[PDB]
Amino acid sequence: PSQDEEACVLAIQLATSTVLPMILKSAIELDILNTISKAGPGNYLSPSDLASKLLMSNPHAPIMLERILRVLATYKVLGCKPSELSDGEVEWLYCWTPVCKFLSNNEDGASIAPLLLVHQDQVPMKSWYHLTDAILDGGTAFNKAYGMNIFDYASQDPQFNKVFNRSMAGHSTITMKKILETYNGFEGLKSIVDVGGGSGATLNMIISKYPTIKGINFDLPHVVGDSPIHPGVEHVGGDMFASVPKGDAIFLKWIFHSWSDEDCLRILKNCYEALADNKKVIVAEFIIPEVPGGSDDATKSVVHLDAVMLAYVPGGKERTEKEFEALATSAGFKSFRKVCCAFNTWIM
Amino acid sequence: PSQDEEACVLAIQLATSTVLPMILKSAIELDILNTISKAGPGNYLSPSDLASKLLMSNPHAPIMLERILRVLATYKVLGCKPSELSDGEVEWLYCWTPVCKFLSNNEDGASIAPLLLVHQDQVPMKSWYHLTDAILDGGTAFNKAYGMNIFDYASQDPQFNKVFNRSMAGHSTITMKKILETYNGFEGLKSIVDVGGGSGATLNMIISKYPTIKGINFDLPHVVGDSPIHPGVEHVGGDMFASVPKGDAIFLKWIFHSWSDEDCLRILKNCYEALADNKKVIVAEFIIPEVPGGSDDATKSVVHLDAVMLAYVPGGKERTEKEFEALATSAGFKSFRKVCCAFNTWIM
Ligand SMILES: Nc1ncnc2c1ncn2[C@@H]1O[C@H](CSCC[C@H](N)C(=O)O)[C@@H](O)[C@H]1O
Ligand SMILES: Nc1ncnc2c1ncn2[C@@H]1O[C@H](CSCC[C@H](N)C(=O)O)[C@@H](O)[C@H]1O
Ligand SMILES: O=c1ccc2c(O)c3ccoc3cc2o1
Ligand SMILES: O=c1ccc2c(O)c3ccoc3cc2o1
C-alpha cells in the first residue's frame, strides 16, 4: 500500500503544479524576494515583518504572505525557522537562500526573475492552449494563437517586447558573468558580432572585462531601438537571414534552439560569409543529454526549454552535442569543440 | 562555484516550470497516458509506435510526442529504456508507471487526470492574474476576475460545471476506494448525508461496499441535476447554509478547506442540528503539518491546495489538525479524533 500512496500523491502533486510558477510570479510582483534579499542571509522575517517592510495596507496581507512564503520554502526558494509565541504557539520565520538571490532583481540587473515573468505573461501562456491542436493538426501552437510568430508579435506589442528582452538580458548577465571566469575565447580578437544579441547585455559584460574589443550587438530593429548603450558596443538593426555584420568572431547565444535545422544552416552560412578564414563561431546553448530520464535541476531546465521551444516557435528545439556538431559540419565548419559550461549554458 | 551552479539552475528550472502542468494537460488530451496504460507495465513504446496507435495524421507528430514523452519521463510519469537502431544510434522507448495509472482515465472513472484539467482550465487559470491585486487591495483573486465566486460561476457555465465536478469525482473515487480498506466508521449506521457530495462518487463507493445503508448526496442544484444515479444514493439539491438533511452521520470531504472559520462554524451548526445526540460528523481533508518546509510530495500536495484555495475561494485554506480540533470544539462537539489517512486525505 506504500507504493500506491507514493504514486498517487505524486499524481495529485503534479495535477496541482500550476501553483508554483503562479505563486512565484506573485512573490516577485509583490517584491517579497527583493525585500528578503535586502534583509540578507540569516535575517529571518515573519509574515508580519514582511508586510510592514513592504508597507502593505491590506489588513489580511500578513496571513496571505504567510501562505505564499510557505510555498516558496517548500520549493527551497526560502529557508525557515520557528519562533515561540507567548502562549506556546510557534511563528514561522522565513529567510534568504542563494536561490532567492538569483530570483531577486539585483541592482546589477542580473536576475532570473524576469525569465519567470515572460513565461507567465498572458501572451505566451495562451500558446499552450493550442499545443494539443498543433500536434493533431500540424502548425505551431503560438502561431495558431496569434497568426504570426513570437518575434513578429514582439514587434507589434511594445509592452511584450520589453518583457521579452528583459528576461533574456537578466539571464545572460548572470550567465556571461560566470562564463567569463573560465573562458579564454575572447581574449585575442579585435571585435565580436553578437547575432541576435537582444538588448546587448552579453556584450555589455564582454566589453566591460575586455575593453578595446569592439562589440557589435546585432538584432531586429524593434529590439535594438529600445535598448540602452554600453561603450564598446554598437547596436545594429537588421535580419540575420539577410546578412550578418562582419567581425573577428560571431557569437550566438540562445539563437539556434529557436530555429529548425534548415534555418540554423541558413544562419550559419551568413556567419561563414561574414568572417575571414581561420575564424570562430562561438555558440552558447543548453545541450540535451543522450539519456532522457534524469530528474535533477539541470535536466529539468533543458527539458523545460525544449517544451517552451515546441509551443513558442516553429522548428525550435534543444539539441544534443552530436546534433550541434552535425550543424557545424553541414555548414562547412571544420572544427567543433565543446569548451565549458556555466549555469547549464555550454560554450561550443 | 558548485553551490552557485546548483542554486542558479534551480532558479532557471523554477522560472520555466509552467511547462509541467501544460505538457501534462496535452498528454492527457492526446490520450497518451490511457494509450500507455492500455499497453501496460513493461510494454515499451517508441514515439512512432504511439502516434501509430493513436492514429494521428500529422507527419511531425512522432517527434512532437517524443519531446512530450521526455518531459513526462523526467517527472517520473513514465519510465524509459534505449533501443539500438541499425546505424548505431539509440531510440528511446517509454513505458507505464504506477503514476501513469493514477493519471489515466480508468474505465472505473477513477483518475487524477481530471484534477489537472480543472486547474489548467482557462476559467480558474485567470484567477492567478488577480492574486497580486488581491494581496495589495483586499478581495479574492477569483471574484476579482469574474465578479462572483467559483460556485456561482459553475452554476452559470455548464461546461465548467462538468469539468469541475468530474475532477472531484475522479479524485474521491480513488481516495474512498483506498479509505474503505482501512475505515470501520460506516459499518454500523443507517444512513449518511454527504454534505457537498458533488456528483455522488463518494457515496457511490460507500454504498457499493455497504449496501442497505441509505446514502443522501447533498449539493447545490446545478450539481445534483447533472449527476448520474447509484442505487442506495439519493441526490438532494439545497444549500448547506440553509439546512442540512438529517441522517445517521454527516460526511464532509473537501468542504471546510473552502470556507473561512466563521463559515465552517455555520456549516457545523447545521450539521449539529441535523443529527441526533451521540452521533458523528465525519470529515475528510488534507492536513497542514506543523513544520512548513518539507519537500516531499505529500507536503507539496497540501501546500498546492492551500494556494489554490487562496486564489479560488474567499477565506478558503488548508488547516492543521489543531485547527480542525478547534472548529469541532467551537461547534459544541465533544470528541475529536484523527482516524486514518489515504493518499494524503485524513479522516477526522
Ligand atoms: N532575423 C531574426 N529573426 C528572429 N529573431 C531574431 C533575428 N535576429 C535576431 N533575433 C533575436 O534573437 C533573439 C533570441 S533570444 C535573445 C538571446 C540573447 N542572445 C540573449 O541570450 O540574451 C531575440 O532577441 C530575437 O529578437
Ligand atoms: N451551499 C453551498 N455552497 C457552495 N458549495 C456547495 C454548497 N453545498 C455544496 N457545495 C459543494 O461543495 C463541493 C466542494 S468540492 C466537492 C467535494 C466532494 N465532496 C468530493 O470530494 O468529491 C462542490 O460540489 C460544491 O458545489
Ligand atoms: O526560457 C527561454 C529561454 C530562451 C528563449 C528564447 O531564445 C526564445 C525565442 C523565442 O521564444 C523564446 C523563449 C525563450 O525562453
Ligand atoms: O485540487 C482541488 C481540490 C479541491 C478543490 C475544492 O474543494 C474547491 C472548491 C472551490 O474550488 C475548489 C478547488 C479544488 O481544487
Curated annotation (Swiss-Prot), chains A, B:
Changing residue 308 to N: Abolished catalytic activity. Strongly reduced catalytic activity. Abolished catalytic activity. GO terms for cellular component: cytoplasm. Changing residue 305 to A: Altered substrate binding. Bergaptol binds at residues 119, 257. Pathway: Aromatic compound metabolism; Secondary metabolite biosynthesis. PROSITE patterns: SAM_OMT_II. Changing residue 258 to I: Increased catalytic activity. GO terms for molecular function: 5-hydroxyfuranocoumarin 5-O-methyltransferase activity; O-methyltransferase activity; protein dimerization activity; S-adenosylmethionine-dependent methyltransferase activity. Changing residue 308 to F: Strongly reduced catalytic activity. It catalyses: bergaptol + S-adenosyl-L-methionine = bergapten + S-adenosyl-L-homocysteine. Changing residue 254 to H: Slightly increased catalytic activity. Strongly reduced catalytic activity. Strongly reduced catalytic activity. Changing residue 258 to H: Abolished catalytic activity. The active site is at residue 257. S-adenosyl-L-homocysteine binds at residues 172, 196, 219, 239, 253. Changing residue 119 to F: Strongly reduced catalytic activity. Changing residue 258 to P: Abolished catalytic activity. Keywords: Cytoplasm, Methyltransferase, S-adenosyl-L-methionine, Transferase. Homodimer. This is Bergaptol O-methyltransferase. It comes from Kitagawia praeruptora (Peucedanum praeruptorum).
